[PDB]
Amino acid sequence: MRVGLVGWRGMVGSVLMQRMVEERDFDLIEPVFFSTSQIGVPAPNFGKDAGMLHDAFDIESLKQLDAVITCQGGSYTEKVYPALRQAGWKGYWIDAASTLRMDKEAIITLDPVNLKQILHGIHHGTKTFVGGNCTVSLMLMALGGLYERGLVEWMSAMTYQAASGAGAQNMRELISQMGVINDAVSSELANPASSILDIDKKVAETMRSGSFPTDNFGVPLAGSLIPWIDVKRDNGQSKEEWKAGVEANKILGLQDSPVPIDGTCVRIGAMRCHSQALTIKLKQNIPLDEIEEMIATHNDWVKVIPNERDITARELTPAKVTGTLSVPVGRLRKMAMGDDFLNAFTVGDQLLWGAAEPLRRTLRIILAEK
Amino acid sequence: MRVGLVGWRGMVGSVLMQRMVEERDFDLIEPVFFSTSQIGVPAPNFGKDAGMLHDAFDIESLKQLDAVITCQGGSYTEKVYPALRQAGWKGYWIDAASTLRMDKEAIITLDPVNLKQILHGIHHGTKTFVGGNCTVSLMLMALGGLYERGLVEWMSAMTYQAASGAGAQNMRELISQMGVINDAVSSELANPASSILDIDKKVAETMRSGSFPTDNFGVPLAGSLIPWIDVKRDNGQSKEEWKAGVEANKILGLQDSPVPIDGTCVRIGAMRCHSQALTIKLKQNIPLDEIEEMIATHNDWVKVIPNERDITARELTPAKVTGTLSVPVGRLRKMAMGDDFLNAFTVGDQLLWGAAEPLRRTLRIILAEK
Numbered sequence A, B: 001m002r003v004g005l006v007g008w009r010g011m012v013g014s015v016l017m018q019r020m021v022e023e024r025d026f027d028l029i030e031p032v033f034f035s036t037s038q039i040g041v042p043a044p045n046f047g048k049d050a051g052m053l054h055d056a057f058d059i060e061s062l063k064q065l066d067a068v069i070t071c072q073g074g075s076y077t078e079k080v081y082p083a084l085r086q087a088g089w090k091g092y093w094i095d096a097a098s099t100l101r102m103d104k105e106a107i108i109t110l111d112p113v114n115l116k117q118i119l120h121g122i123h124h125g126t127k128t129f130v131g132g133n134c135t136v137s138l139m140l141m142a143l144g145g146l147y148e149r150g151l152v153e154w155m156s157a158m159t160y161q162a163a164s165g166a167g168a169q170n171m172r173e174l175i176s177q178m179g180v181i182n183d184a185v186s187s188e189l190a191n192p193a194s195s196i197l198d199i200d201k202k203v204a205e206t207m208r209s210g211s212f213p214t215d216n217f218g219v220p221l222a223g224s225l226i227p228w229i230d231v232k233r234d235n236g237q238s239k240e241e242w243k244a245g246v247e248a249n250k251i252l253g254l255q256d257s258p259v260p261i262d263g264t265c266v267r268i269g270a271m272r273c274h275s276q277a278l279t280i281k282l283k284q285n286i287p288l289d290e291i292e293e294m295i296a297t298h299n300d301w302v303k304v305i306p307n308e309r310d311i312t313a314r315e316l317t318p319a320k321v322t323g324t325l326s327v328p329v330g331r332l333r334k335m336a337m338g339d340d341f342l343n344a345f346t347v348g349d350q351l352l353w354g355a356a357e358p359l360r361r362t363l364r365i366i367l368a369e370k
């Protein structure tokens, strides 16, 4: 199978390339690498010689592929995909971008949750497979066990989203902001006798100052938060908040009887893990031990963290999870509202299960089943 | 009125002293300053000469006061308060500490919400007035308008709590952690061609390394979060999470018909503002304009931020709120679960309304009404 890689050089793409090298995915395919800025120079060598970088916008080049895996983004998909399909291309389009998620001809791919749906699509002629929004995917990797048993009546999701979700430059800005904060008070920090109110005054001044690097975020992220992600929608939701409901219900095949999913999506000063605090209304009073088992046994990556203080602090954090495929979920307990209310807190890496991982896994499923 | 100040030198105390200087509170009282480490040296001059620092543990000194305002902490109150009352002291005890909050002889003081309760207490012989938990106070300052009309059926609160809540040393640690993160990748940050994955790898390594300053938190806060605050309780709540329900219902005088309040309390890398994402179940379908008006008109400090993207990013953040008495609340909208579900996101300064402000205000109310 001849497979085109688009957007391989960027952040999501680079994570994908690393994982494909680790799992030796290139042994299984004839890779063809594409570019927008380096067309015609030698392609990267990830174990296999793929020749030259091809033109990402050249429909005649793309047409010759059996599949495309693209991490290039929505603008690219909007330009290229319709032209490709119109040209009669029947190849597999595997996409990180949100563009085609809600298209009737596309399946949102998160195989530990919806493998059967993916297999059914492959059998019955589906050629477009799209990764879900990072938040949706990470939530379902954590709570798949509850959703598959149809136990969720509704869910409120308050998120703690890392800078990586906004982009590589936003991550860089976060770290730079951290540096500027510390620089402003490094002297008083080194002095044990210094006043916390003096330190605080300078930190606040610095974060507000013109010189504080805010070109990407518009406002500080380090030392703060931003309770709005993506464009506004008519009902008052941000696009990020809206994605959860429509995408999860499509993945789960519940579009005829959708689970209400809503909440506030908040950007915090984490590097590359998204965390979520969930109020989960269940249809039945189910004992906590049974809930924990249902959750734990759903997939190989979810990890139930015992509701104890010290283990939570060590395990249920971005610092622990970053750069790993582990999806810990903890603080599992019934809430004051009733024994059909379940509290959960989960953390997952935004670039792995939230981006790159479903793409490479979908490739392997297609290879086995086509 | 002869008023003792205990814990005036610490973080909360220092904020209190600043506010008392700003509002010229010392004109109204004969201040007597106490100490544990500098007994017998000249007291601070905040406009008035108060003589020498007295022994904070000397019951014979405390007995001579008409009132005590203490920011010293729970350990101090546990040691001193029972002995003071047993000695027949009938003075006013105004306390930042959690110790006496749930005692039947004490009123939790948050006058923009419960002035009438405070006045009734003063009239009928209450001598102990205690500030509520920072999270509870800040939530009620935002949502007082809804709670006073008895419209809240239940509320789920997912918090974003600043380092200041844990203490001055924890704030210092947060900033130091930020510095260490930036130091590790400052070179690659200055290089536009550097790889985000290389930067990420080093940041992750650094946060995990032994040398990362974590003596106070135990784990990283900068670049991460900690979804556990304070000791575990039997039902699986942390003490911080438990405080919300019992304290809010006492403030509101609803102990006979309590509103269920629960959620997860999370420490994030903010300096001194606590933020909260709330799922509020209302008893009635009330139009959003009416909800906004009810909220906005409750008190002088709550600020309804329009549910628009750019204004939210500028106004509804720790960076905006820090060091001010403003309590913005935004993202006000009906949720997917139904028109009796209300989403709200609020930010408030932890040291002002969450600590120092109710103490000085209670002093003034007592002076007027006694």
Ligand SMILES: NC(=O)c1ccc[n+]([C@@H]2O[C@H](COP(=O)([O-])OP(=O)(O)OC[C@H]3O[C@@H](n4cnc5c(N)ncnc54)[C@H](OP(=O)(O)O)[C@@H]3O)[C@@H](O)[C@H]2O)c1
Binding pocket: A006, A007, A008, A009, A010, A011, A012, A013, A034, A035, A036, A037, A038, A071, A072, A073, A074, A096, A097, A098, A166, A167, A168, A169, B192, B193
């Ligand atoms: N302005 C922005 O912040 C912006 C821009 C792009 C994407 N995005 C978002 O990010 C998602 C795409 O994932 P991503 O974050 O992985 O995209 P990304 O990092 O921006 O990479 C996408 C493409 O940009 C090119 N690129 C430009 N400068 C680069 C650099 N310094 N290092 C590596 N590649 C560079 C590369 O294509 P070539 O090899 O052909 O040069 C790469 O394949 C999209 O869904 C989109 O929403 C935002």
Ligand SMILES: NC(=O)c1ccc[n+]([C@@H]2O[C@H](COP(=O)([O-])OP(=O)(O)OC[C@H]3O[C@@H](n4cnc5c(N)ncnc54)[C@H](OP(=O)(O)O)[C@@H]3O)[C@@H](O)[C@H]2O)c1
Binding pocket: A192, A193, B006, B007, B008, B009, B010, B011, B012, B013, B034, B035, B036, B037, B038, B071, B072, B073, B074, B096, B097, B098, B166, B167, B168, B169
């Ligand atoms: N180990 C801890 O992290 C610890 C310690 C204390 C309080 N707390 C918590 O914090 C709350 C009290 O508020 P807070 O945070 O304002 O307390 P704080 O900053 O620790 O100040 C409380 C007292 O500690 C003394 N102190 C010791 N070192 C100091 C320093 N370097 N600068 C100024 N004062 C110093 C002061 O008393 P003197 O003037 O008599 O020396 C001060 O009044 C309590 O509710 C408690 O839970 C925690």
Ligand code: NA
Binding pocket: A209, A210, A211, A212, A213, A214, A215
């Ligand atoms: Na700036």
Ligand code: NA
Binding pocket: B209, B210, B211, B212, B213, B214, B215
């Ligand atoms: Na350490």
